[PDB]
Amino acid sequence: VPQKVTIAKIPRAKKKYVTRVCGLATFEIDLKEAQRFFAQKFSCGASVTGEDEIIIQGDFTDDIIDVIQEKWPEVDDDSIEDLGE
Numbered sequence: 001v002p003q004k005v006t007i008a009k010i011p012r013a014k015k016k017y018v019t020r021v022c023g024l025a026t027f028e029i030d031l032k033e034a035q036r037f038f039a040q041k042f043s044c045g046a047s048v049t050g051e052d053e054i055i056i057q058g059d060f061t062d063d064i065i066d067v068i069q070e071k072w073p074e075v076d077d078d079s080i081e082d083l084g085e
């Protein structure tokens with residue numbers, strides 16, 4: 001009986017997403033330090049991508065609300081909204 005090892009990758013149906021945060025600068029949060037905070041808390045790249053918006057290179061839509069409010073308590077529950085897709 002032969003003696004061999006094979007490795008391969010097989011796509012899943014689950015998509016890779018990107019997480020977009022808009023409105024931080026309206027609470028007079030600085031988008032640059034917001035970007036770097038997100039980068040480090042999530043261990044994942046991020047960039048300011050609009051004039052008030054930051055894009056994080058993963059799906060963090062579960063935590064992202066609580067994380068935002070922990071770090072910036074100004075942001076009350078009636079002013080941060082999870083859109084969807």
Ligand SMILES: [Hg+2]
Nearest residue numbers: 022050052053
């Ligand atoms: Hg936006």
Ligand SMILES: [Hg+2]
Nearest residue numbers: 044045057058
């Ligand atoms: Hg990542």
